Amino acid sequence: PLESQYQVGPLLGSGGFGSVYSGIRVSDNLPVAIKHVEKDRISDWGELPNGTRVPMEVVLLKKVSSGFSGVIRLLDWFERPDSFVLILERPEPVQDLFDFITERGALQEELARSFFWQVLEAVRHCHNCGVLHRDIKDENILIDLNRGELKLIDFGSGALLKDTVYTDFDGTRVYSPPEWIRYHRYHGRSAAVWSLGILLYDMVCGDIPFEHDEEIIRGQVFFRQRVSSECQHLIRWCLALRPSDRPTFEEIQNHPWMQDVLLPQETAEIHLH
Ligand SMILES: Nc1nccnc1C(=O)Nc1cnccc1N1CCC[C@H](N)C1
């Protein structure tokens, strides 16, 4: 049973994603996160190779499963009569990117470069494994404060990556691209790159560039903080109105603003000490 295998701690958060609790695996004292999701609230249903219908997140997290620290690890999962329980890895000490930016304001470009690079490495790993996250944002990024390593969380709005159009979306509207707003249509990679541009603006400015549909559609970027010309260029390129004008992950990582990234441990030493 789940109740004998894990010691339940405080609620870490709840919302559209369900309810997430801090926990401890009783056997080895390993820190875990216990995620509960009600069956009636599930947006994307997946199918396990053995045939059983599970939340898409269970399918997606199994697809990415490796020694790669950039994606939160699924440790175990359970079915209950009206819900699913997901046992996830829990870094300690940890802080999500949203709380980190709230406490510190706009980040130094060196810090933003290190964090953005790790998000890109994590997203590239998902895509290479046939997984599309669909809800890339500061709230879905965990910072391992000791190691300076970032992890992607919440694959509950995700899908299997495909080359055809998506007509469904249940991620964050303010991170969604203008083709979703205008037409209820987007392609995986170019929509992911748009959300990445919103994320990078958020990191260097301390807030998102757009709040309303009209602003997303217009796509005019205003810099409220001092941001280098190379960083402003990368942001505007990710935020191109025409999806095909957006850079590939390779063009992003080869961008001159992305050069000479710090190692995660150098990041923890300089910026998280
Ligand atoms: N593994 C974790 N370790 C520490 C903290 N959180 C998580 C987590 O999975 N969180 C999570 C999963 N699915 C949806 C939302 C989640 N968050 C809950 C805490 C607040 C965070 N912004 C979102």
Side-chain angles (χ1 to χ4, degrees), residues 1 4-46 49-52 54-272:
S4 72
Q5 250 193 285
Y6 304 94
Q7 196 57 58
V8 188
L11 178 69
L12 297 176
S14 81
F17 53 84
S19 301
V20 180
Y21 293 84
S22 176
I24 287 295
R25 189 164 67 192
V26 174
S27 77
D28 62 333
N29 296 106
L30 179 83
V32 297
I34 304 161
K35 179 174 182 172
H36 298 258
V37 65
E38 273 189 47
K39 286 188 183 164
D40 301 338
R41 302 172 193 184
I42 293 162
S43 89
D44 300 85
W45 285 89
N50 53 96
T52 47
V54 299
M56 190 48 83
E57 184 168 31
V58 171
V59 167
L60 307 173
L61 285 178
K62 281 212 179 89
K63 285 176 64 59
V64 292
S65 285
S66 63
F68 175 71
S69 82
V71 174
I72 207 69
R73 219 153 41 227
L74 180 65
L75 296 176
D76 205 358
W77 69 269
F78 303 84
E79 184 166 349
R80 244 129 78 137
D82 301 274
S83 68
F84 281 94
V85 183
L86 271 68
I87 312 303
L88 303 150
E89 151 187 23
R90 172 173 63 89
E92 170 64 34
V94 77
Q95 193 182 41
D96 69 40
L97 189 51
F98 178 89
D99 293 352
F100 188 87
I101 294 165
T102 302
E103 282 168 24
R104 288 168 66 135
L107 312 183
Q108 283 179 34
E109 289 197 24
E110 183 185 73
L111 182 49
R113 176 183 298 115
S114 174
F115 280 7
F116 195 64
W117 182 269
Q118 291 183 55
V119 177
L120 268 133
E121 289 288 314
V123 174
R124 286 182 57 206
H125 175 74
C126 294
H127 291 217
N128 190 65
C129 293
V131 172
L132 185 67
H133 190 288
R134 294 157 117 195
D135 197 20
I136 301 158
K137 52 170 178 186
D138 51 9
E139 286 174 321
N140 291 333
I141 295 160
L142 289 187
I143 305 162
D144 178 328
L145 301 161
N146 279 353
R147 294 204 185 269
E149 296 171 11
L150 275 60
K151 307 186 175 267
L152 275 177
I153 59 162
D154 191 15
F155 286 67
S157 295
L160 295 181
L161 183 69
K162 71 189 187 197
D163 298 302
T164 53
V165 77
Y166 293 85
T167 58
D168 71 296
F169 177 78
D170 190 40
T172 308
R173 201 175 176 88
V174 288
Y175 283 81
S176 77
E179 60 279 12
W180 164 259
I181 308 289
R182 291 161 67 82
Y183 312 115
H184 275 207
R185 289 177 64 86
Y186 63 95
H187 290 81
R189 298 155 183 103
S190 64
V193 168
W194 175 277
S195 74
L196 288 167
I198 302 290
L199 177 64
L200 177 53
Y201 181 99
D202 178 55
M203 288 187 200
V204 300
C205 287
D207 209 353
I208 55 171
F210 318 125
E211 287 290 345
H212 305 120
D213 289 355
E214 294 73 13
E215 290 182 82
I216 299 167
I217 284 164
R218 182 162 180 255
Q220 184 71 47
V221 183
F222 169 83
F223 283 89
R224 53 182 94 206
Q225 300 278 306
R226 160 75 205 191
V227 177
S228 74
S229 304
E230 284 182 352
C231 183
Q232 285 200 17
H233 176 267
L234 181 52
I235 293 165
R236 289 190 168 105
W237 193 13
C238 290
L239 301 184
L241 285 187
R242 177 176 192 182
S244 62
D245 281 337
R246 292 175 208 152
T248 62
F249 299 138
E250 182 189 5
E251 287 175 316
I252 295 175
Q253 295 197 298
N254 280 334
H255 192 275
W257 187 69
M258 290 278 266
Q259 297 323 292
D260 307 302
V261 73
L262 291 178
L263 296 185
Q265 200 42 74
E266 278 165 352
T267 306
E269 269 147 34
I270 301 161
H271 299 282
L272 311 179

